[PDB]
Amino acid sequence: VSVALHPLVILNISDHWIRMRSQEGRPVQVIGALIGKQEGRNIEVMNSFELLSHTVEEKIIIDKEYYYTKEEQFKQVFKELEFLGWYTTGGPPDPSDIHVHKQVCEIIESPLFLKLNPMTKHTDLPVSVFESVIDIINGEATMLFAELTYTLA
Template sequence: MSAPSDAAVAAAAPASTTTAAASSGGLTFKLHPLVIVNVSDHHTRVKAQAACSGDSSSPSSSAPGAGQPPRVFGCVIGVQRGRTVEIFNSFELVLDPVSGTLDRAFLDKKQELYKKVFPDFYVLGWYSTGSDVHDTDMLIHKSLMDINESPVYLLLNPTINLSQKDLPVTIYESELHVIDGIPQLIFVRSNYTIETVEAERISVDHVAHLKPSDGGSAATQLAAHLTGIHSAIKMLNSRVRVIHQYLVAMQKVQSLFFNCR
């Protein structure tokens, strides 16, 4: 039995087994909304690009099959304080279409750039999209263990399910289990809570208010929003033009004054 298959079995195991496995790690996960927004945006952009080009392959995605949305990949970053892991942000990664592994040079470059902006953040693991764990996910997971010996795997399910009340996000840890007498790494589900700061709450509230709630279409609300922005820019332009004309007139007056002297 291969390790990736065991990972998929562990992900679908009964709740008691998964809970017992997760409790052995004792880690508490806190997920910030920005990560969910980033992953969703990444998936939406790649899906739209694939639809426009008529090709489901992309440097940062992998097509699981015809008619299936392309998968996207990236790293999650944050801090770990004791047994508490807080995931603050994420950045996109490129998947090598030939080997099926992450582009390590691209990863190292992105990590270096993010370290300059967020010196206290570390790579905690990686993310992907899909309805379930894939056979190749454990290979990608193991390739990040030299950066973080126990990386986190965040899986977002982009399929819309109107009857589902919970967020379509699952966080996995990897644990070493003995299966059929062979030690193997498997994925186990972990519980998490949503953690927000004031700036994130304002942003999420703004996005929520952009959603049509009065029966109007999104295009109608977008048109009204853009019309308001256009009016504001037009008024700003007229005010700047008045200031410019005033400064030009003052410059002419000063020039005449000095010439008369």
């Protein structure tokens, strides 16, 4: 096995998470399929879409009917494509992902698993501090910005 990954997949998944967080106000886990082409050993994950599910005791159940109906409904436009595996959002792999993985493992034999962590802290954005300094090179004179080093409480 060896894997390629279009950036559209990663954007698709972020967008799914963002659309969902908005729906409730709080961020929730999202789940979906990985599709694409699989030539030679070049597994090319070309795209993705959303998968329905339902959560109960922190256990997630994939809606199989929804998947097969979509596959049915989309077989003509996804003819050159294949189901490669599934994705979800969050941190390092958890027991719950294995539980979901076994269900995807019932759809295709050895499914890929893509996990994306949409968690970002604002405090990680670049922050530069400057002080103003009036420079006069022999001849030309001006005000410039001179960078300062800073600590964080």
